[PDB]
């Protein structure tokens, strides 16, 4: 069933249009690099209603749904692939809670947000939404294939 | 509810120590929004009221010859929730029982120099703010990030 | 003299683009001492007296509108060379001009635009601090780290 | 005059050295517009077409084996001044002669592996955007902080 | 108390991870006083005496054949509860378990390839000391900033 | 030559400001590789070899005391053009005249509170690494990022 490395676990991450506006591209990735993870995948895009109704399907008829589709689709967003072991789990603990008010300092919700609705980031939930979610913004042709030399140092 | 307010000084070992723009700029990086700030070395008086919930216990004059010892950054701070939140951003009463991330977790060891005072509650908060800055020092005006900050 | 002191104001672009504490940090880990501080909105008088030497000139206008728009974060420093090494730390006029490394280098784009004042002599220090600053208002204290600063 | 862009390709080097998202943000913190963004693999047509002035050059090869090695960080950034003032973010030709603020100057050695690339004057940069990016890929948006960046 | 002492190493992954200046800072920002720094290719004794309590187990060859690799940052710090504290700011054994903020939360992966040791105990950081480093390596010295460290 | 390589010691003001990190960092960014690292409280007659060129010159007490006067973190950092660069990355002698960027422009004052040297040439840099360190002290190894730093 499974290859002899997890290591190759993939998680979506998408800074939203506040996470644009507020200048945090950069801020955000550079945790992401320091934690050790892959950059698979990376491009800003202002995404279509249909993106991100599907992005978002799970909460379709839902009161909040309309509301979470008009803010994604309002300005670009910088849509990307991490891959390593344990990546998504590990990225919803480093994007910290729902609330960023009860997000820990550390975490990006925690250090940089306030609001709910304007809370910076999103990251898959787990292996089966990440597997989505990737296949839904990205094509294959836009995953970018390497091997960090540095891999030597992150993993036994 | 975005317009609750809080008051926070760096005493007089965050100010030696060289910590003044490394805290602020936490605050100003959480959309917190910066109503009032002011250096100012507190007189004997203002250091009795503000700390005039410990009068008479055997730490109350420490506390007040500590914060009287050297000048203070004084400031108000507005937004959402900002009482609890910068009490969670300060971290424990006490340093070694502070996270890592926590100002008190990454800069503090010992709890009578633990660098920063924060409100306990929006009551506390009021009090504080208006003994400290008259209404004058505060300033009224707009963050345009905050279509960013705020849904 | 070590004791020499400059006027630096963070202007209303510096506080709505939230880099007061990353600016003041760069102040306190160069060694300079801060004397003063507050956030006030200037009046129109305060800031025609601030830019007096351009008054009849033809951005003289924009400059007071464009200081009174916002709160300004206005500061006291103090050590040996303040005046000239404030001026290298924030850069050329131009931020385009200027350095990676200073302030406006490294963050700001346009003339109007740019940040940051500070006196640009020892005597208009002297002038600047006195117009914003009361005497009661400047911090009368020693850092322990001058030790380690000065010689 | 505000609407001029560049291309940056942050290079194989500092795709593997970690330094992608340190140095977008130096370009947020100046107040530039990122318009477009995307890690590409370059294929051998795209980098012998990146580099076709130096067709035929004995080291023509070694800079199309190099770009071609590994994911490149490719962007457009736009703001007044944009070209001129990435080339100085960015810093000499010679990493080693480059001043510590700029890019080269902070993160690296050698020539041959001097992290970033950005374009030399407006019509290469106009090459070079049209060349990396699909007039789809460009993202039309006007960041709320321009009030604060641009006079 | 305040002089209580720990034992920190920087183990192979985090000197080729460029890692070594990262981690001091944050004990000094802590607080914590440098008694003892060096770099040094630990041999295969010290590396076996170091992990003693892990001989005879099937991970004990491992951890030895890696921290006799390359070069490891070893050094000593003391202040008040520095052994409890240094242990929360490296985080849990799991890096992927630690909490941001935390040096294995920031910075690590793999259990393997978790960048730092730290004492466990008061006990076992008075045998690593002692292990590591000979009395003539422990620099005696009082730190001015100790009057805002330390009540 | 890549291996070429300099002595750099952040002296007893880096070290009581607590600098020692934050200097690591900036050479380990920028591509260099350490060699040794140590903290040592310098003898007198270290100091006097150190400085020996000085002696019989009025300054030469002064230098040798203040060497002595706390801990040093001494170093050998090794790659192409590292002797020049380390002196650009420090600055110029006088701490108000280095420009922003680098270390004594970003963090000193005063030609006697420097905070760090670093070899002024090659024949230097091997007298006082040979000085300060024992061979037995240099560590040998390869950095795996050296692909991404050197061509
Ligand atoms: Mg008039
Ligand atoms: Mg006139
Ligand atoms: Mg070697």
Do not use: C
């Amino acid at each position: 069933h499974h290859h002899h490395h997890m290591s190759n676990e993939r998680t979506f991450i998408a800074l939203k249009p506040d996470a644009v506006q507020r200048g945090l591209v950069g801020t955000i990735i550079a945790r992401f690099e320091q934690k050790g993870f892959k950059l698979v995948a990376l491009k800003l895009i202002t995404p279509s209603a249909d993106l991100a109704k599907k992005h978002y399907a799970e909460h379709d008829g839902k009161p909040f749904f309309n509301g979470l589709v008009e803010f994604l689709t309002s300005g670009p967003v910088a849509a990307m692939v991490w891959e390593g072991k344990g990546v998504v789990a590990a990225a919803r603990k480093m994007i910290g809670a729902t609330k960023p008010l009860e997000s820990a300092p550390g975490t990006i919700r925690g250090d940089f947000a306030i609001d709910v609705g304007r809370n910076i980031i999103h990251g898959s939930d787990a292996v089966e939404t990440a597997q989505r979610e990737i296949a839904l913004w990205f094509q294959d042709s836009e995953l970018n294939e390497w091997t960090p030399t540095q891999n030597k140092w992150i993993y036994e």
